[PDB]
Design a protein around this ligand. Structure first.
Ligand SMILES: CCc1cncnc1N1CCN(Cc2nc3cc(C(F)(F)F)ccc3[nH]2)CC1
Ligand SMILES: [Zn+2]
Length: 321
């Protein structure tokens, strides 16, 4: 006995949840120890092509550091981390609630009262990250997962889920103008992202789009905001204050940050203490018939100089409690 080793054989692969790129995400079942039978998401980085670029190494290690030090109800929980020769493994909680914005297609549009709830939850996660000097940067609708209870969970603090290739890699439609033209980034970028995510929640589409890439960049830089006439005056005001070309003029850009954004009349009905405690019932509680329940194409299961390696030293992790 002693502490549990925790290597790849401790987990059996149930199915693919996503694949890059620099690796793949599996739904797994713990098969050894007192945890035997518990469902997790397992992130597997192909580590031999991460060390070939500094910025990718930076993100991989930042992630591993952030998921250890940062623990928040609206952020994905890291349970185990370990490495095997050529591979990096992150064991995280299986978020059986799937993508939040997958509900959009089903709902058509989210109502403000609904959108407000989830936005309040995202803003709380953003608040905590900024408190710890972390800025997300490219926050997309796809980054917002949901736990088993239907509450928000921020994911993807890692490298890039894309196979193509890192702004401009994948989809750019939710990124602040200052990130696009690559001229400095700060906390304000995340409040833009919040605005863009809000607009998508309430219109089913991102604020500015184009037929091609060049036109899309231009449409964002021009920042000609079109607001649908079905939006309340409070929602109209928040989007106008969140989506400004000038990052300084943006809401939350100042030292007030999240609390400032959270003070907007749009959130006037949110009990923040209850929200953070998750006592508030979420508008989409998913119904699950087992712990290993999937509702999110994915199908077909595989893998669970030289010595210049000092980068992922101390990579191994097991989470408190
Ligand atoms: C791991 C947390 C999670 C928990 N429960 C259910 N779903 C989850 N996710 C959240 C992350 N998500 C998008 C995604 N990020 C990826 C990163 C990679 C990478 F290897 F980094 F290149 C590969 C595929 C990826 N797919 C789908 C699976
Ligand atoms: Zn990329």
């Amino acid at each position: 006995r002693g502490p549990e080793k925790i290597r790849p054989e401790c987990f059996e692969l149930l199915r693919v949840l996503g694949k890059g790129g620099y690796g793949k995400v599996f739904q797994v079942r713990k098969v050894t120890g007192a945890n035997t039978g518990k469902i997790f998401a397992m992130k597997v980085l192909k580590k031999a092509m991460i060390v070939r670029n500094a910025k990718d190494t930076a993100h991989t290690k930042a992630e591993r550091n952030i998921l250890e030090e940062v623990k928040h109800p609206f952020i994905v929980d890291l349970i185990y981390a370990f490495q095997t020769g050529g591979k990096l493994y992150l064991i995280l909680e299986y978020l059986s609630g799937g993508e939040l914005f997958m509900q959009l297609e089903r709902e058509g549009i989210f109502m403000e009262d609904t959108a407000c709830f989830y936005l309040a939850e995202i803003s709380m996660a953003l608040g905590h990250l900024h408190q710890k000097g972390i800025i997300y940067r490219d926050l997309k609708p796809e980054n917002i997962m949901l736990n088993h209870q239907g509450h928000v969970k921020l994911t993807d603090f890692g490298l890039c889920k894309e196979s193509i290739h890192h702004t401009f890699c994948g989809t750019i439609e939710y990124m602040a103008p200052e990130i696009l033209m690559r001229s400095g980034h700060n906390r304000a970028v995340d409040w833009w992202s919040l605005g863009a995510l809000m607009y998508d929640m309430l219109t089913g589409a991102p604020p500015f789009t184009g037929e091609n890439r060049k036109k899309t960049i231009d449409k964002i830089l021009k920042c000609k905001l079109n607001l649908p006439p079905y939006l309340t005056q409070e929602a109209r005001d928040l989007l106008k204050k969140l989506l400004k070309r000038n990052a300084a003029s943006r809401l939350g850009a100042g030292p007030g940050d999240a609390g400032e954004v959270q003070a907007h009349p749009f959130f006037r009905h949110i009990n923040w203490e209850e929200l953070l405690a998750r006592k508030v019932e979420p508008p989409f509680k998913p119904l699950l018939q087992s712990e290993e329940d999937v509702s999110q194409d994915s199908k077909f299961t595989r893998q669970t100089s030289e010595s210049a390696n000092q980068v992922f030293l101390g990579f191994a992790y097991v989470a408190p409690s």
